[PDB]
Amino acid sequence: WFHVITKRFDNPVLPFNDGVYFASIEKSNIIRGWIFGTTLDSKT
Amino acid sequence: LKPFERDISTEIYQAGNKPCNGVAGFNCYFPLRSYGFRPTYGVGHQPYR
């Protein structure tokens, strides 16, 4: 659970094991989008 | 190999137990090579799509 209000703004680079369930109880329409990567340096 | 694996690797690999770290010399065979596609040999060497 992450709450955004330090700056209380968690956005660390999270694992992606087999799929993800993502939910948002939001109002600021801060939903945009997402990275996905494995090597981060052109290995793939 | 793997199901649906894309191999466009162009960085030098560690062969044997000699770390290269960008030297492309001993134990550092560069992973790419190119064909000799000339109309010289028979069918066993010419391209197909």
Structure tokens at A22: 């993502």
Q: Solving technique for this entry?
A: cryo-EM
Burial class of residue B20, CB neighbours in 10 A (0-12, 13-18, 19+): middle
Q: Which residues of B touch A43 (CB under 8 A)?
A: 9, 11
Give the single-character DSSP code of B3. T
The residue behind tokens 């109309």 is: B39
Whole-number Å distance between alpha carbons of B47 and B38: 9
Instruction: State which residue of chain A sits closest to B11, comparing Cα positions.
Output: A43
**Cβ neighbours around A23 below 10 Å, total:** 6
Give the single-character DSSP code of A36. -
Mind giving me the DSSP string for B10-46? Answer: -SPP--TT---SS--STT---S-------TTS-GGGS
Residues whose CB falls within 8 Å of the CB of residue B25, separated by 6 or more in sequence, listed in order? none
Structure tokens at A2: 């992450």
Whole-number Å distance between alpha carbons of A21 and A16: 10
